[PDB]
A = this chain, B = another copy of it.
Amino acid sequence: GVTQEYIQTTIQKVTVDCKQYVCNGFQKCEQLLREYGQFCSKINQALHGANLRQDDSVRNLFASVKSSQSSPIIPGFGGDFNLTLLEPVARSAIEDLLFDKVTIADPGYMQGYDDCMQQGPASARDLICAQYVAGYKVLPPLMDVNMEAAYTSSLLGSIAGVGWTAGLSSFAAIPFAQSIFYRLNGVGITQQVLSENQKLIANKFNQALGAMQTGFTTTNEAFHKVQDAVNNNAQALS
């Protein structure tokens, strides 16, 4: 069977303009604002430091994600195990299901500014065009989703395996099914049982995996947390 968890790792990065948020080019307020110009300086510096911390956490995480070595990955990997997680070489169908289920506003950067501008549909409702009114700036993520896909595939390549001592130097490079049987004997299932039930094991395993297609529902709490991570960012800007 399976369980799931969502661990947030970042806050969306934004900056603001204590010169565009307070007033908008009126000369009278600019002069009044000058008496308070140091408050903006504190605001800008504080936000800047917060964004630096977010980038630090990303790099630190990736440093452990990377492996010195991995298996190449091909379709049909895992043998009788279904392994829907394999990329459509890509990200993965599972990651895309998540993104489709998420209700988040259409993405920034390109085309950006021209979705605020009249060269687009009147039905746009993005706070991102309001980004250019409010003085908001949304900084881009550091990671770049393509590099991110590369990192998650690298973790799949470290599978098969950890067993065989420490696994902190050597790379076993064995079939996925074999690493599974090793783990099953690691929990006190006899070797004899494992050899007799090999297909049965794969069948039960894929039933549990197949249930993930129903996992994207509001009763899945891990899923719910993902949605609320999105909700919190949107609320702050609003």
Chain B residues within an 8 Å CB radius of A188: 165-166, 169
Residue of B nearest to A186 (CB): B166
State whether the Cβ of A168 lies closer than 8 Å to any Cβ in chain B: yes
Chain B residues with Cβ below 8 Å from A117 are: none
Interface residues of A in 133-182 (CB under 8 A from B): 165-166, 168-169
Chain A: interface size category:
under 10
Q: Which residues of A contact B (CB under 8 A)?
A: 165-166, 168-169, 187-188
Residues of B within 8 A of A168 (CB): 187
Residues of B within 8 A of A166 (CB): 187-188
Q: Taking each of A165, A168, A169, A188, which has the highest tally of chain B beta carbons within 10 Å of its own beta carbon?
A: A188
Contacts of A165 in B (CB 8 A): 188
A-B pairs, top 6 by smallest CB distance, nearest first, are A165-B188, A166-B188, A166-B187, A169-B188, A168-B187, A169-B187
Residue of chain B at shortest CB distance from A189? B169
In the complex, 6 of the A-B residue pairs with CB atoms within 8 angstroms, ordered by the A residue number, are A165-B188, A166-B187, A166-B188, A168-B187, A169-B187, A169-B188
**Smallest CB-CB separation from A164: which chain B residue?**
B188
